[model samples]
Target: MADLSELLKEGTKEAHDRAENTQFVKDFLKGNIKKELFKLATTALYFTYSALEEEMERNKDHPAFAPLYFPMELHRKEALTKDMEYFFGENWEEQVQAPKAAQKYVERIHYIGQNEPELLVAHAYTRYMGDLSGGQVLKKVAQRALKLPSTGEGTQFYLFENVDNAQQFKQLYRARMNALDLNMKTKERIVEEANKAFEYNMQIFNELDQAGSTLARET
Candidate 1:
């Protein structure tokens, strides 16, 4: 039998690659995204993480969550807040509006928080683990594309200051995953949820692309 981590990676590989290759992500990686579009993405991410962390907190006591609850080092609520402030100013909350895709994503997160709390593990794994991995690369791309300060002010989402060694931290995280007391069926369900999470991300990217095109046409 394959390890849970390996199963998850293998199961979600196609979705992960598709999400990464989405037009919006590709443009962002190529430093071709406009400032407004970039800001839109950031704001959308803020809402996504807001719902994610809120759900994580709601399920913190669940068996599936207790083993992985490292809120102090892993939480992104505050980091995302800082980034939102930097991008949108003091009135950021009011100014921010989630597009249809983001609203749907947030709804799913909240749904899992309320009814399917055990499934929260899939989301935590998808977001935080990906942040620890590919997010570092995105941070550099964002800095150069957006011409942001070198200091970690706006890019706080990608900056794991609490984690001295991201690779080691990820290893510990995976070890915890490997130790989770879940049955094979439950593990398979988690993998399915992880793939759905990736799909949700791609939907957001598609929404961004559509918005960008609208802006281009208007201009």
Candidate 2:
């Protein structure tokens, strides 16, 4: 087997790079978003991270020894906040519109449900092998950037089923990974990147957290 330490170092470097991008979002939020709305988004993350941390604790009992689960707040309930939707793109809805957006979200979900479950499975695989966390961070960023541009509750089209099984997902993921015949170094590097993916995620949360803390004091 390849040296895990070297692989981890590479993963850490990858994380730092991704973290820089995550920081970029933080900078954008601070500079672009209205301070008040940014604070609201930051508060949302406070609750969301609580769920993520809770899941991590809950998974401690699971036999997979998997890393704690990362909860996407948008997935916890229906309705996307304006910031959430806008994260996907300012004109995401205007681009697709309402019923069309709903249709597209459902259509995309249908494809994932039927054809490319492997993508979900692959994500789960990375979570297990790399102990990844903070998927919510990426989704939140995407949602905020892509979906909403107006003042509204959030999004109707985008939602999470919230029933991913890491062990089961990984079984299929490995089957796929194995059948694909990727070389060892590549496999290791991919896994390493996957692990560090969460850290990149946290960089966003951390800034959001900072924004929130500042807001609370201001309020």
Candidate 3:
């Protein structure tokens, strides 16, 4: 019986590569990251999490999702809302809308949450885990490239202030995922869905790369 954590780690390797190798991703890792593009990325996250956290709450009682519910620690929408204000200003509520690529993700989260709540954890895994792990590293990149203040400012998405130790918290999360009463077929499908999540992100990175180069021209 493969642990869902291990299954996810091994399973998403190629998917990870697909997103990781995007030109924007590569540039971000060692980047001339534009402030406009970084702000848009944060905006994109705000809209995406709004849908995700909303759905997770809606299905909080679903058999498959209940065990993994850790809203206090892992929920990002509230954190993202503040980050939205930091970037978009107090007027963020009016100015911010889901980027087209981001809306694609929001719609899929809704599809899973409403139609097949069982599969919702795939997105939860794709997002929170990546945020805890890879995102921590990316946080530094944004701070350096965009010259953001060191902490508690524009980079709130990766802060996870509620998490005392992301490394151990991740272990606890994976254990909860493993404890889900799933069969082998479902495990495989969750893996597939996680891959889909990565591809969705890759598309957003693609869009940001193009738009940042040309549209963010004022900077």
Candidate 4:
């Protein structure tokens, strides 16, 4: 086994790489990657950004969002994830103040997902270290929701009935997310496995691209 700190370090590096790879996704959408699936994949990104912007602008004064109620004086803070605009499009300026609102919406939706295990069940769960629900990531979001006074709407991920136990589902999901067993060997192994998964998915995209679809082929 590799050191835990080493595994975490690699994970942090993966996060950085993941952010950088968002640009690759933009390129893939323009060049290849099934258009319908691509659009479907990005729908969440577009809506999440938009909804958060609208919600925050509307709720800046709500006491439940107290963590966000900085003095009018602190408005000088620069935007979070400004480097990500290229992936979002040129309209990114419209969302300069969107991070906080987007975060709020995400947390509330997570709580909704937790309370409704069926939705959590059908949700396309993934964790770097494990499956989706075992990670308990959504649970943390739900927990945070209790801290807030109230929330808005249209935030469920998915729903399914009579699936595996939801608590066990989330616990395993979190374990996978943390990739707690990831020493250097396991971390590198998982990275390679992830690369293979991407390639396999991309191959399907390439095949579809060749059929002269909306998606360009062979970049």
The candidates, ranked best first by TM-score, are: 1, 3, 2, 4
lDDT of each: 0.87, 0.41, 0.86, 0.34
User: Per-residue lDDT tens digits of candidate 4, residues 86-170?
Assistant: 2345585575332333344445435423342222211112112222232244323422433312231111221112234556544
TM-score of 4: 0.26
Better of 2 and 3 by lDDT: 3
Q: Where's the lowest-lDDT run of ten residues in candidate 2? A: 96-105
lDDT of 3 by residue, 36-60 (tens): 8888888888888888888899989
Best of the candidates, TM-score:
1
Ten contiguous residues minimizing lDDT sum, candidate 1: 91-100
Q: What is the lDDT of residue 122 in candidate 3?
A: 90
Q: Which pairs clash in the backbone of model 1?
A: none
Q: In candidate 2, what are the lDDT values of residues 1-219, reduced to their tens digit?
A: 443334444556655455556643555534444444443443344333333334444443443323223344223323343334544456643443222222333343344324433222222333333322433344454447544443333433233344365445444434434444345655564455445445535544465556656766887
Backbone steric clashes in candidate 4, count: 14
lDDT by residue for model 1 (1-219), tens:
778888888999999889878998888888887878888888888889899988888878888777788888988889888988888889878767887888899999999889987778898888899888877888898898889999877889888878888899999998988888888898889999999999899889999999999989988
Assess every candidate by TM-score.
0.95, 0.34, 0.93, 0.26
Select the stronger candidate by lDDT from 2 and 4: 2
Error of 3 at 12 (Å): 1.2
